[PDB]
């Protein structure tokens, strides 16, 4: 029921001149937007990516981001000159911004910044702040960034008002895609070293249940791997069971998933 909306920015600064900024946007585990460095405009990756924004509202929003990208790029470059020679290129910066949507018109917005792959800075309330563990030198950038009242007011409106509204509309518009059910297909294999593998692929959404079973006995030696993505926005998972050779017969792989609607997949070795 709870969906997290994530705008993810990746910025690489190799030297004083060369830089690139790339962005992707997620609603839950579905990609809604893409913004390549090479592109002047934000790309929709779904038909419903504009949500319930009118063309005029979207154009105004995109323009704000266009100004931001150019500005952010110059700001980092200038902050590097300002801290010289404490910090140096290359520099990787990541931004994670968005809002978590709760039922009954509740939401929490966030804007987190990582420097060289470490969370250092967030926007909180009405200002930028460092987080615990952040280096002291960041106090000067924070002081400069907090001097810009215009950015502060813009971000506040962006986090407090724009995000929750936009996402509410996204949830309405993308309802059918968010609630789609895709059936998993399973298959079995084995690698002697023996280890039995149960492959489960093509399922959506993410929640799934996979256990190796002898009859009705749950084999506690089952090791669930990570969730791996397919290209078609479905998921892949495998569960491995370590067995003694000769004791194969009797083992089955049971898969429960919401898309099957009661009809569990059972595959006997």
């Amino acid at each position: 029921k709870n969906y997290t909306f994530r705008c993810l920015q990746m910025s690489s600064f190799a030297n004083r001149s060369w830089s690139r900024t790339d962005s992707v946007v997620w609603l839950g585990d579905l990609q809604t937007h893409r913004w390549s460095n090479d592109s002047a405009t934000i790309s929709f990756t779904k038909p419903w990516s504009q949500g319930k924004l009118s063309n005029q509202q979207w154009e105004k929003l995109q323009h704000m981001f266009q100004v931001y990208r150019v500005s952010f790029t110059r700001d980092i470059q200038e902050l590097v000159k300002m801290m010289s020679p404490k910090e140096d290129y290359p520099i990787e910066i990541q931004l994670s911004a968005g809002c978590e949507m709760y039922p009954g018109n509740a939401s929490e917005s966030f804007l987190h910044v990582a420097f060289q792959g470490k969370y250092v800075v967030r926007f909180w309330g009405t200002s930028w702040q460092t987080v615990p563990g952040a280096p002291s030198w960041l106090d000067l950038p924070i002081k400069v960034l907090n001097a810009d009242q215009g950015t502060s007011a813009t971000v506040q409106m962006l986090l407090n008002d724009t995000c929750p509204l936009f996402v509410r509309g996204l949830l309405e518009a993308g309802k059918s895609d968010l609630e789609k059910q895709e059936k998993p297909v399973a298959w079995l294999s084995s690698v002697p070293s023996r280890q039995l593998v149960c492959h489960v692929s093509g399922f959506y959404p993410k929640p799934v249940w996979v256990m190796w079973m002898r009859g009705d006995q749950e084999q506690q030696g089952t090791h669930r791997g990570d969730f791996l993505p397919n290209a078609d926005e479905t998921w892949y998972l495998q569960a491995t069971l370590d067995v003694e050779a000769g004791e194969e017969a009797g083992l089955a792989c049971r898969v429960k998933h919401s898309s099957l609607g009661g009809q569990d997949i059972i595959l006997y070795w």
Partner: T-cell receptor, first 112, second 113 residues
Framework: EAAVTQSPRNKVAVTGGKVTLSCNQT?????MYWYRQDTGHGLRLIHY???????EKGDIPDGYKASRPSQENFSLILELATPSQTSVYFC??????????FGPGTRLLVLE | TQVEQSPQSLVVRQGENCVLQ??????????LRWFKQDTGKGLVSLTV?????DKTSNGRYSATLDKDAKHSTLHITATLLDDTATYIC?????????????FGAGTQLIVIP
């Protein structure tokens, strides 16, 4: 209240000669900026500084060198003066805010 | 140049009002400042406009800013001899020291006493 001083206020120099324009500020501002003003143009940024030991190229840095030996002092150095550097030079300082506080200006004439 | 001023120059008689204008293409446009510069002197800040549709006043000086149009005017009411000067429009692209200033070339005003 935040005052900036420039010296000298007026200078006659020869081509190939060395000229140093000095800027002093007692406001404890990190940031200092050198500009030149020429007819038919707005003020154009030559060099700036974010602190002691720091100098940065502006829009038109060619033929100029900058020097920030201390927080108080920002120098503009013309190693080999040319007539094209005949101009009025303005220094400014500021903190983290957007306001720049301008000095009274320096008139430079480079004769052949 | 991203900041253009009009008129280039003008002559008015004491007691008359005049309008000076500034058109810019600076992006972004955090704020706009008007300077008075007496001949052979420094820059005296007259006003700073910051809002989308801003209006300011400073004695006989008043100014408007329209960010949508990227246009500003400075009004001088009841000119005096001492208004004889160059009026310079400056746009700042940031609300902080990370900003660059964009200077107009100015408007020369002469007031005949």
């Amino acid at each position: 209240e935040a005052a900036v001083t420039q010296s000298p206020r007026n200078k006659v120099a020869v081509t190939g000669g060395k000229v140093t324009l000095s800027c002093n500020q007692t406001n404890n501002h990190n940031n200092m900026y050198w500009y030149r003003q020429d007819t038919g143009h707005g003020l154009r940024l030559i060099h700036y500084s974010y602190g002691a030991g720091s100098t940065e190229k502006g829009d038109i840095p060619d033929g100029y060198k900058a020097s920030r030996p201390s927080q108080e002092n920002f120098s503009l150095i013309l190693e080999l003066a040319t007539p094209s550097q005949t101009s009025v030079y303005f220094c400014a300082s500021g903190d983290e805010g957007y306001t720049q506080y301008f000095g009274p200006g320096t008139r430079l004439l480079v004769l052949e | 140049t991203q900041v253009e001023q009009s008129p280039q120059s003008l002559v008015v008689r004491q007691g008359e009002n005049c309008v000076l204008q500034c058109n810019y293409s600076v992006t972004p446009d955090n704020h706009l400042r008007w300077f008075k510069q007496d001949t052979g002197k420094g820059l005296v800040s007259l006003t700073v406009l910051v809002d989308q549709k801003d209006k300011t006043s400073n004695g006989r000086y008043s100014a408007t800013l329209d960010k949508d149009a990227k246009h500003s005017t400075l009004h001088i009411t009841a000119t005096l001899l001492d208004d004889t000067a160059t009026y310079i429009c400056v746009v700042g692209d940031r609300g902080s020291a990370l900003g660059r200033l964009h200077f107009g070339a100015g408007t020369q005003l002469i007031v005949i006493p």
